[PDB]
Structure formats: C-alpha cells, structure tokens
Structure 1
C-alpha cells in the first residue's frame, strides 16, 4: 500500500534574484502569519484547498481541450528528523510571472504562521514551461531561481518554527487532515497512505443523489444509526451562495459549516434558528472566514424560511408522515414561536402547527391557513379529549372550531394573539 511521489529531484543551477515587495503587502503578510487565523493547524487546510483548486484547473482544461488526464493526486509528507512538512500537487503549475506577481494565494501565506523558512518549486502545466524555485524566510524578501527536475504542479516544503515541530509527526498531521479535508475533491495521501474517503454530496445535482448516499452522510454528520426521516437538498445562488443538506432523524429527541469542500466549524449552530437545533446535516458557502455575529445572519434567515416551506410542502405531500413528525418535534415549533419577536416570524413558524377540527373528523389535523379557507376570526377550545371537546357546551352553541388537548398548545395559541386575517380567541371567553 506504500505510495509516494515526493522526492528531491529539483535543483537550481544558477543564482537567485532577490525581491522585496512593498511595505503594505509586508504588513498584510505579518498580519496573516500573526493574527489572521485564530488556529494554526488550519495552514494544512488552506494549502490543501489551494492544491485542490489548482488540480481542477488542470482537469477542467485538459477536458475542455480533450486530452488524457494525468495522475491528479495530492501528497503530504512529514519529516520529524528534519522537522519539515511537504505538500505537493500535480495540478497545473504557476508561471514565473505568477510566482512573482501574486500577492487565491492569500491562504498559501498562512504557512508563515508555523514556518520560519518556506521553499517552493513550481512548473506550469503548459508544455515547454520552465520550473522555478521560490524561497523566503518571512522577512518580506523572497528569492527566485530557475529550477530543474520540477514536476508539473507545485511543491511546498515548510521548515517549521522551533516550537511548531509537532506537525512533523504523521499522527498529528493525519488528525488535522481528517479533521478538515475529509471531503477533498481529489485523492489525498499522507506519507503514502490515502486519508480521505468521503464524497461531499452536498455539491451534487440533487436529482443525481441516491438514497443510500444520504443515509451514509447522515450517519456521518449525525453520527447515528437510524435513517433520515426527512431530507432537504438546498442549492441557492440568488440570495447567497448555499450548498447544504438537512436531515430530520428517524429517532425522536449539530450542523456542519463547510466551505469550498473544506470545514470551518463543526458546530455551526448560528446558521439555523435555535428552534431548528434538531436539524442535522451540512451547510457550505463561499462567504465565511471563533466568533460569529456577522452579517451572515441573512443566511440564517434564508435557511429558516426555506426549511419552513419545505416542512409545509411535505405536509401537503404526505399528511400522516408529517403528523408523526409534528407529534415528535412540535415542541421546537412552539418554542420558536414563543421566542420569535416579529409576529411575521411567529406566523411563519405557526404555519407548521396542526390541530384537530370540529368540522374535520376526529383523527384529522389541519393547519391554520387550511382552516382559514372555509371562513372573520379563528376560535379554538382547549379540552382534554375529543369526546370532551365535542360535548363541550362552549362548543355546543354553534361555527367551525379547533381543539387543543395539551396545555402548551393552548399557551402557544395565546402567545401569537393573531394570525393573518384572523384573531385567535378562546371559545371559553
């Protein structure tokens, strides 16, 4: 199973030319290495992502021009003795100008957070392209030389800081890799061993997903053995860039925050209203950078609205299955209603609520709007059982009414004092 492509074939025959970019870039650079990211291990993530993006560029072009595909792999090698960590990719390399002009690569710089000396070799995938070597110690001055024996792609060799040698250990690197890069879009190896094994299905055309795939991914993100009770595959580009999958568990009573097929936070509870905390799955957007009160709240609402409609349409696609779901999760809806501030938010959430009707036969649950059809005001009755609710003289004088058999349901109706073109009033007035 041993497989590695990283070895020291490159070399520079001549001398290098020294460069020092402008003071501002120097500041932005010291900023990236000191205060940009809150975690240091994430450098393994950023570089990996950059490699993946480069490989697609090659594949997309080799296909757009109809040529055979080479080995599109991503390799990471640790050296504890030399205290080094290397990452190489076959993805279409960088030109000489690029290696000088750039500064995308905003994430490549993250390495200086852990490295005191960075060493790079690149060879643009275009034929007849030359390989070049890029050196730097983080002081704002880099060297460029023409290198030989450079394979098409990019190779990065990091000489860790005296205190960051922990990464040079394989086990540590694999922990980080499996933490962030478990869904990378290209084969990834670490000292020879393939690490990733998961497909980020949340990027596929929803019409091209299979049920067993959703079950596997649900059991991963949720870490359960039951199957999904409900599944929502949401892609959006008009409000914001969203690619997510939401699962309602089969068993009765969090969501991951990915981006560019790489994970930022595993418990992105902010992305969904607190009353929807029972949802599992993933949400992936290109709009996110250990604190979150950001404007991404708009996302938190786009999802809140989208999920509501999803739960409404489901009620109209299967009433008994949704009835079981509501009997199992209505606690959250009533909570989110009692907690909502704008009455519009409450009424939106309340559209999921279902009750038994005086005109409907016992055992039938209806939404507020559905009852609204037969109508100038809504009227309910909080009684223990259907027999008691029908026998009720308060009801005996009748036109159509709804029945509550639990105290929290009555309190819920009393919280949202009104609904749409209606007013919620107790028959026991």
Structure 2
C-alpha cells in the first residue's frame, strides 16, 4: 500500500498580512528572475537537505527530553494536472518570527528558480504553536496569515514555471532524488512510495563501522566485486570539515587513465576529479565536506589536506604490516613514482617519496628499506644518499663501483623498477641529502 501525508488540510480564516522583502533579498530575487544559468534540478536536493535538518533538530530535542518520537519523514508529491511539486516533512517547523525574519536562504532562491509562486505552511513543534501560511510570487512582497489544519513541520508547494513543468512528473523527480539525495538519513517518500535510499556510513564515528559495512560500501562506490585491501575513514573538523572514506582495491591496477564529492550527504559531483592529486586516482571512496561552494582555493586546500592524510596513512600501514605494505608498493608504486615526477613543489615530492621502498646493500636480499631508514643509518661524514639502478640484486652487487664502496661501509640502495631512475632524478634530494647514482 501507499503511505502519503500530503493533502490540502490547511485553511485560512482571515486576511493575510502583507510584508515587503528586504532590499538585499529583493536584489537576489531579481538575479534569479533574470538568470539563464539553469542547473534547475538542484532545488530538490536543497529542499530535502533542509527537511532533513529540520527533522534532526526535532529528533535531537525530543531525545534530550524523555519524549516519545513521532513519525519523522520527508514526503514529495508531484501533481501534473496542477503543475506543482510539494515537499513536506514532520520536523521542527518554523515559528511566525522565523517565517518573517529568516539554509532558509538556499532553499529559498532555488525554489524561485523554478516557481511562479511558492505556498508554504509551517507549524513549530513547540507546544501551543500556531500554524501559518506564507505566500510569495517572487515580487517584493510576501504574505503571512495564521492557518488552521497545519501539521507540525513544514510543507512547501512550488507552483512551477511553464518551462519547469518537468518537475511535476513523478519519473523525473524520482531520478533527481536518486541522483543527488540517495543518502538522506530520514525516510523519504515520493507520491506515497518509499524511495530506495542508502546509509551514509562516512558520517559514522569510524570505530562504529564494521568491515562488512566497508566491504558493501566499497563495492557500491567502486562498482567492484573484490574487497578493499586498505580502508581509511578520515573524519576531521579542522581546518576543514571532512567526513571521508578511502579504499584501495585488493586487485592490482586500466585504472591508469575515483571519489564522490558530497556536502552533508548531498551529492555535489559523482566523479569529482580534482579532489585528490592525480597520483592518488587509484583511491576509491567518498569525501563529504560542509565547507563546499571549482578550481577554488577551497578545493585546492581540501586536496592538499587529503594528500597529507593519505600519505600519513600509508606510512602508518607500513609500520603496522610491512609485508602487506610491500605488496601494496609492488602493486601501486608506479602511481607514487608518477606523483614524484609530476609534482611541482619539492616538499610534495619528498612527502610522496616517504612511501618508496627499496632493497639495500645493508639488508638481506628481498628486504625493503625506506629513504628515512637509510638516512638514519648514514655514517658521520657521509652526507648523500647513494643508489644503483640495476635489473636485479645480483647485477647490482657485482657492479665494480658498488664493490669498491663496500670497503668503506657506505650503504647503497638497489633499485630494480624501470622508472626508479627517473623518480630519483626528479626527487633530487631527500631530507637535505642529495640522491646520487653510483654509476653514471
């Protein structure tokens, strides 16, 4: 059966009171009316986001009391024969003061992007609150009147413009909801039918997400069938709001030609390249930041924060399980080398270089060392990092130049990957120590 709450229960006994929009609001309404910039479908995800916020505010306050929880739901209704789309939620609602004084910005301008007029009913969840009707056609006036039959929460009826009638088709609205609003955290219904929505596990505290939940989400966001070999659930609130999960696949890398971008569980970009550095394009997963608006200073800042955190994560993994990290470096190490070569900043080159692992003349065959570990073994008076590129360890060890160096205890990195020469040429130095090939 169907489950709908939207219907014409409201009535207004008296006359409305007329108010004039304040000057800046009127100016923004003028921009909307004249704007041809028309990613028009966005109003739906903003209204759903505001409904979700209103529901959470109610739920938290009732839980802070001993109070039972009512039905907390978001409903959409389309009406083709009347050219409307309606959203209604059973959240905290608005007082008359807020309807006159006042998120209320974002829901407002995008509604008037698609509306000839907007008809709102709201009733605060506070006990003894009255219901109100708010009306505007986007001119400099709005109307408010006390209304009977308003359900606690907020209902917004958008009377669509003649060129926006597509949003009174159920199938069109269904697709918009699924595209941008699939992870809304309260039950969502369209025309009485429950929408298939998913759990935004990146918002949970990382200690609460189980491996089976990560495996299901990884397979979903990567459209994969393996499991992730690594999982980084990164939550921070400074300098930026970040709720993110990053996976690296169990399978090897073609992946050589990403990460979805959200803002409080609202999709911004399905496949947001530019959010990670190019060399991290093998990462799958999701990044959610409240701080999001396009080659902005903010995106650059988020990218640099995430790069540092992922490098730290991989360093941490090498300490937790060196054998698993060595396999990761074997499988994904060409991305690290690419990043060193293409990086502009020396500090970024050296940060990525902390992930490189090489054999060494000082270690058993097959055992790997990092550049930092090599540096900690350098003997006083010797101030450079020496390496030798060769096809295998036997050929490196029988270099006449290495053999001579053995006499004075100098460690030499043994590098067997064909792109090691270019990587270490471009790195040039590490921790103020020049990288020098022992053969020219």
The TM-score bracket by the shorter chain reads over 0.9
Q: Deviations over 1:257-291 (max 9, x none)?
A: 111111111122222111111111111111112x3
Contact preservation (8 Å) 1:122, 1:132: yes
Shift of 1:211: 0.7
Deviates more, 1:263-272 or 1:96-105: 96-105
| 2: CA distance, partners of 1:63 / 1:185 | 17
Q: Deviations over 1:358-417 (max 9, x none)?
A: 111111111100111111211111111111111221211132211112331111111111
Contact preservation (8 Å) 2:123, 2:153: yes
Instruction: Tell me: CA distance 1:239–1:348, structure 2 relative to 1, closer, same or farther (3 Å).
Output: same
Contact preservation (8 Å) 1:50, 1:105: no
The number of aligned residues is 428
Shift of 1:84: 0.9
| 2: CA distance, partners of 1:71 / 1:100 | 27
Root-mean-square deviation (CA, aligned residues, Å) is 1.5
Instruction: Tell me: CA distance 1:210–1:37, structure 2 relative to 1, closer, same or farther (3 Å).
Output: farther
2:384 equivalent to 1:377: yes
- Taking structure 2 as the reference length, the TM-score comes to 0.94
Contact preservation (8 Å) 1:273, 1:304: yes
| 2: CA distance, partners of 1:380 / 1:356 | 10
Contact preservation (8 Å) 2:292, 2:298: no
| 2: CA distance, partners of 1:36 / 1:266 | 24
| 1: CA distance, partners of 2:216 / 2:261 | 18
Instruction: Tell me: CA distance 1:49–1:33, structure 2 relative to 1, closer, same or farther (3 Å).
Output: farther
Deviates more, 1:254-263 or 1:102-111: 102-111
Instruction: Tell me: CA distance 1:16–1:104, structure 2 relative to 1, closer, same or farther (3 Å).
Output: closer
Give unmatched runs, 5+ long, in structure 1: none
Shift of 1:44: 0.3
Instruction: Tell me: CA distance 1:60–1:275, structure 2 relative to 1, closer, same or farther (3 Å).
Output: same
- Name segments (4+ residues, structure 1) moved above 4 Å: 32-38
- Taking structure 1 as the reference length, the TM-score comes to 0.97
Q: Deviations over 1:116-143 (max 9, x none)?
A: 0111101110111110101111112111
Contact preservation (8 Å) 1:134, 1:142: yes
Contact preservation (8 Å) 1:33, 1:111: no
Q: Deviations over 1:19-43 (max 9, x none)?
A: 1122321012233565597511010
Deviates more, 1:193-202 or 1:312-321: 193-202
Instruction: Tell me: CA distance 1:109–1:225, structure 2 relative to 1, closer, same or farther (3 Å).
Output: same
2:438 equivalent to 1:427: yes
Q: Which residue of 1 aligns with 2:223?
A: 223
